[PDB]
């Protein structure tokens, strides 16, 4: 629950985070490192509650990401971080690194907001995931209920409508990014804060738009267990254990089970096609069209950011993929809209 994490400052870093964008702007790597050492000596993370460790992972993660921006592996330099992060990871049962959950919904609104830089373009990513994530999560719960409901039941269509409504939040989030974040300023000023960090022999990618649980929607709604060697399934496979634990069993189940649409494709061609059954199948295509209204503008944005003109020193997002990945997720989704449009043609 996000409001009880956002209000916490378990490492007393609030004043520091008002200095951070200037610290980062003047490349003051010594205050960064001095703060990491101070933390591993001023706090026994073992005594933390779950909410405390989640907010600590947010704050420590961003200081760590700021050191890695300059090119220094932060745990390699402050060796005592490794057991500190170990202990945080045990309490949270999440990666010893911040994700878009800590960057968005668990990031406080207003004066306490944790930001890497003074550029207003940064706000376009934070607001983007802070809006997207709550609505996808609600859609996730509602979409899971469609499996155990008949197309002919109005309850099916009302759940799918509520889910398409909640997914629109991700549209609102990506529209907020498109208006606030300059593709050039992002690549040159923001992107280098989301680079991999080596912690205990493993490398943990930085925060990413792709960490919003939208892929969980995908897996349950249309991907399921039908594209076993996809590159999309490998990304999801790599994402499962970055998600909060609450979401992992849904995602694992859905990867191992036929999708809602694939089953509802079957029930449709095997039952008395009533008027409610078509409304029900039309509410599935509504959800998918809401996904398209997100992926289409998202694609253009990453395309402008990664053009020769604006890409700066990168050719990939923080998860290591080019725009080819988004093109592939978008075509998957487009093709799903074509299959439903076909089932519905009469």
Local structure of 200: helix, strand or coil: coil
Sequence-distant (≥ 6) Cβ neighbours of residue 24 within 8 angstroms: 66, 69, 116, 117
Least Cβ distance, residue 263 to ligand HEM (angstroms): 23
- Applying the rule CB under 6 A, the residues between 213 and 252 that interact with ligand HEM are 214
**Residue 301 interacting with ligand HEM (CB under 6 A):** yes
Applying CB under 6 A, which of residues 63, 95, 151, 207 lies at the interface with ligand IOP?
A: 207
Distance between CA atoms of residues 2 and 270, nearest Å? 44
Both tokens assigned to 213? 């649980």
181 binds, among ligand HEM, ligand IOP, none (CB under 5 to 8 A by kind): ligand HEM
Distance between CA atoms of residues 331 and 341, nearest Å? 15
Least Cβ distance, residue 10 to ligand HEM (angstroms): 26
Give which of 60, 62, 65 is closest to 87, Cα–Cα.
60
Applying CB under 6 A, which of residues 48, 116, 156, 194 lies at the interface with ligand IOP?
A: 194
Q: What are phi and psi of 197, to 5 degrees?
A: -130, 130
Give which of 259, 268, 267, 266 is closest to 287, Cα–Cα.
259
**Residue 319 interacting with ligand IOP (CB under 6 A):** yes
Distance between CA atoms of residues 62 and 99, nearest Å? 10
212 binds, among ligand HEM, ligand IOP, none (CB under 5 to 8 A by kind): ligand HEM
Residues in the site for ligand IOP, rule: CB under 6 A? 100, 103, 125, 128-129, 194, 207-210, 317-319
Residues in the site for ligand HEM, rule: CB under 6 A? 125, 128-129, 132, 173-174, 177, 181, 183, 186, 208-210, 212, 214, 295, 298, 301-302, 305, 316-321, 323, 325-326, 329
């Amino acid at each position: 629950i996000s409001n009880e994490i956002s209000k916490l400052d378990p490492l007393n870093l609030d004043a520091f985070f008002n200095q951070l964008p200037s610290l980062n702007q003047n490349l003051e790597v010594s205050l960064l490192i001095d703060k990491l050492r101070e933390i591993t000596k001023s706090y026994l993370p073992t005594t933390f509650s779950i909410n405390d460790a989640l907010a600590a992972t947010r704050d420590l993660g961003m200081i760590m990401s700021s050191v890695r921006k300059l090119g220094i592996q932060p745990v390699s330099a402050v060796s005592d971080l490794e057991v500190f992060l170990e202990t945080l990871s045990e309490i949270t049962n999440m990666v010893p690194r911040e994700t878009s959950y800590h960057y968005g919904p668990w990031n406080p609104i207003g004066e306490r907001e944790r930001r890497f830089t003074h550029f207003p373009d940064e706000r376009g990513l934070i607001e983007g995931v802070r809006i997207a994530i709550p609505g996808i999560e609600l859609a996730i719960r509602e979409i899971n209920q469609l499996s155990n409901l008949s197309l002919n039941d109005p309850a099916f269509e009302s759940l799918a409508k509520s889910a398409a409504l909640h997914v629109y939040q991700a549209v609102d989030g990506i529209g907020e990014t498109i208006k606030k974040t300059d593709p050039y300023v992002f690549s040159h000023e923001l992107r280098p804060f989301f680079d991999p960090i080596r912690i205990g022999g493993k490398s943990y990618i930085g925060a990413g738009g792709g960490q919003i649980p939208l892929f969980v929607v995908d897996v349950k709604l249309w991907l399921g267990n039908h594209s076993p060697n996809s590159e999309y399934v490998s990304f999801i496979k790599d994402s499962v254990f970055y998600l909060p634990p609450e979401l992992r069993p849904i995602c694992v189940d859905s990867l191992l089970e036929p999708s809602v649409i694939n089953q509802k494709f079957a029930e449709f061609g095997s039952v008395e096609i009533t008027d409610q059954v078509i409304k029900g199948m039309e509410s599935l295509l509504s959800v998918i069209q809401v996904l398209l209204k997100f992926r289409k503008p998202h694609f253009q944005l990453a395309q402008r950011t990664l053009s020769k003109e604006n890409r700066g020193n990168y050719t990939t997002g923080s998860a290591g993929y080019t725009n080819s990945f988004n093109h592939m997720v978008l075509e998957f989704t487009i093709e799903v809209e074509k299959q439903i449009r076909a089932v519905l043609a009469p």
